[PDB]
Amino acid sequence: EREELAQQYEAILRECGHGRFQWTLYFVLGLALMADGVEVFVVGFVLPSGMLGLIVYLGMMVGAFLWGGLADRLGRRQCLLISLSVNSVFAFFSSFVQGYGTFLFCRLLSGVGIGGSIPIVFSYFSEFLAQEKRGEHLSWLCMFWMIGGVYAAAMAWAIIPHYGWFHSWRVFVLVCAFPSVFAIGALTTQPESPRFFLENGKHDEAWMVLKQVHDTNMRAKGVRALSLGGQVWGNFLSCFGPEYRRITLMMMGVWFTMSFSYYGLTVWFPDMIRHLQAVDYASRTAYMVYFVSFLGTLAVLPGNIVSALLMDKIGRLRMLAGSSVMSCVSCFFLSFGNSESAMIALLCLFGGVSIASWNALDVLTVELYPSDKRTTAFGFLNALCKLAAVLGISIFTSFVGITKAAPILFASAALALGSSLALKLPETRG
């Protein structure tokens, strides 16, 4: 059977243990994750300055789907390189645009290019880990997304603290697209994931890559489209086979509900705080939007740190359930606070409580699936997560003049479903 390879692969990985290659690559892929976070922030609160920016999320959905499909048929480095090239190129041309009609098209294309940055990055770094510290390392890697969000927020506040409606978004977009260019430049000098080569049958190339990794670690101590179009459906439609069906549906449900809840709440908080400030002003009778939720992303890092060292001591399923429950209880408790500083503190707490669940999610998604679908399934789940994000943003933007209890209960129900499904997932023996 085409299954008795992971044993020898992990025996080799544990024999080499951990060294400096898994730190160099850690940072190289963290750069791409940082660029993805920068893009997500730019599309979230900076772009709508007319909340039609969800077309960018749709573009990122299509991108994540396509890149997840193509990653295992083109490798985890060629696909990542192409995705980051498309992103950087289009997000750099977005600064020489002439208005909105073409600017939003360029941003949509950049989103399509950068959608396949979380799935490929996480799978690629998962195929270089010893599996006894896999969860902790992946959780640490996740922090670069928050670093990217913080970087984008700081640059946006320092450069463009105003509303679009001589040139501001041009220089701002250059600064925001710098990280993707740096990620490409740093990633040009990495080897394609060895497990991909082993699955392709080119065991010689996989052995060469593994030997190069060992050398790096030892320093211390036309018709082609048809073939590549029907073959990606092999990875996807097989992800609904008898073996991986219940796992995949539960995974889809967890991703959908929890991403929807998080994105809805993160768009809600700045709006509700702004409305409260407006009410305070009436009581007398965007320079702060990049401070709000920027402090949230800064206060999330403690949660990620607490969810990284304990990611393996407790388990990759307990952690998930016990973080989803806490996230749901925090969403319920959000209504308790009715101020500005209190609301900011509650937002920071909720972010720090949900980041642990997110990290457990990303560890479990890459652990469950085999080498063949480790990226196709992850890309599909990320596309569904972005669909849920679009739905959450659209729903939560509507709730302005409606009582906060409605969004509170909506997010609480979504997180309750997420927690139930996560607790209902299979064990870690997969």
Ligand X SMILES: Cc1cnccc1CN1C[C@@H](c2cc(F)c(F)c(F)c2)CC1=O
Of 44-52, 198-206, 212-220, 350-358, which part binds ligand X (CB under 6 A)?
Answer: 350-358
Shortest reach from residue 386's CB to ligand X, in Å: 8
Of 205, 188, 187, 186, whose CA–CA distance to 197 is shortest? 205
> What does the per-residue mask of binding to ligand X show for 316-335, with x meaning CB under 6 A?
--------------------
Give the CB-side neighbour count of residue 202, counting CA atoms within 13 A: 13
Q: Which stretch binds ligand X (CB under 6 A): 13-21, 128-136, 138-146, 413-421?
A: 138-146
Contact code string over 233-272 relative to ligand X, x by CB under 6 A:
--------------------------x--x----------
d(CA 152, CA 156): 6
Q: Under rule CB under 6 A, how many of the chain's residues touch ligand X?
A: 13
Q: Which stretch binds ligand X (CB under 6 A): 71-79, 94-102, 308-316, 348-356?
A: 348-356
Of 76-84, 92-100, 316-324, 354-362, the segment contacting ligand X by CB under 6 A is 354-362
Q: How far is the CB of 4 from ligand X (least distance, A)?
A: 30
User: Of 60-68, 85-93, 162-170, 351-359, which segment contacts ligand X by CB under 6 A?
Assistant: 351-359
Yes or no: say if 46 and 292 are a contact pair by the CB < 8 Å rule. Answer: no
Choosing from 172, 256, 290, 358, the residue that interacts with ligand X (CB under 6 A) is 358
Number of neighbours of residue 186 by Cβ within 10 angstroms: 17
What's the maximum distance between 2 C-alpha atoms anywhere in the chain?
77
Q: What tokens were used for 286?
A: 């965007």
CB neighbours of 120 closer than 8 A, spacing ≥ 6?
67, 68, 71, 76, 79, 80, 83, 375, 379
Please give the structure tokens belonging to residue 5. Answer: 């390879």
Is 146 near ligand X (CB under 6 A)?
yes
Q: Confirm or reject binding of residue 192 to ligand X (CB under 6 A).
A: no
Q: How far is the CB of 224 from ligand X (least distance, A)?
A: 31
> What kind and span of H or E run contains 410?
helix 405-423
Structure tokens at 149: 């969000």
- Which part of the chain contacts ligand X (CB under 6 A), choosing from 84-92, 139-147, 199-207, 226-234? 139-147
CA distance 5 to 27: 28
- Of the listed pieces 5-13, 233-241, 355-363, 366-374, which binds ligand X according to CB under 6 A? 355-363
- Are 122 and 378 in contact by the 8 Å Cβ rule? The answer is yes
Q: How far is the CB of 228 from ligand X (least distance, A)?
A: 26
If the CB atoms of residues 46 and 209 are measured against ligand X, the closer one turns out to be 46
Output the smallest distance, CB 419 to ligand X, in A. 14
Query: Which residues, numbered 62-81, are part of the site for ligand X (CB under 6 A)?
Result: none
Shortest distance in whole angstroms from residue 16 CB to ligand X: 27
Candidates 355, 387, 391, 421; binder of ligand X (CB under 6 A) is 355
Closest by alpha carbon to 60, among 109, 100, 119, 106? 109
Instruction: Return the residue matching tokens 């010689």.
Output: 204
Within 10 Å of residue 167's Cβ, how many Cβ atoms?
7
Q: For residues 117 and 82, is the Cβ–Cβ distance under 8 A?
A: no
Read off φ and ψ for residue 203, nearest 5 degrees: -60, -30
Give the shortest CB-364-to-ligand X separation in angstroms. Answer: 11
In angstroms, rounded to a whole number, what is the distance separating the alpha carbons of residues 396 and 343? 16
Applying the rule CB under 6 A, the residues between 278 and 297 that interact with ligand X are 297
Is 362 a residue that touches ligand X (CB under 6 A)? yes
Q: Which residues contact 297 (CB under 8 A, 6 or more apart)?
A: 146, 149, 150, 153, 351
Closest residue by Cα to residue 109 from 97, 119, 118, 121: 97
306 close to 319: Cβ distance less than 8 angstroms: no
Binding to ligand X, residues 83-122 (CB under 6 A): 118
What is the Cα 216 distance to its own chain's centre? 29
Indicate the residue among 169 and 358 with the shorter CB distance to ligand X.
Answer: 358
Gap between the Cα atoms of 428 and 300, Å rounded: 27
Residue 209 touching ligand X (CB under 6 A): no
Beta carbon nearer to ligand X, 151 or 169? 151
- The residue number whose beta carbon is nearest to ligand X equals 351
Which residue lies nearer to ligand X by CB, 209 or 334? 334
User: For ligand X, which residue of 145, 151, 196, 399 counts as binding (CB under 6 A)?
Assistant: 145
Per CB under 6 A, 354 contacts ligand X: yes
Binding site for ligand X (CB under 6 A): 118, 142, 145-146, 259, 262, 297, 300, 351, 354-355, 358, 362
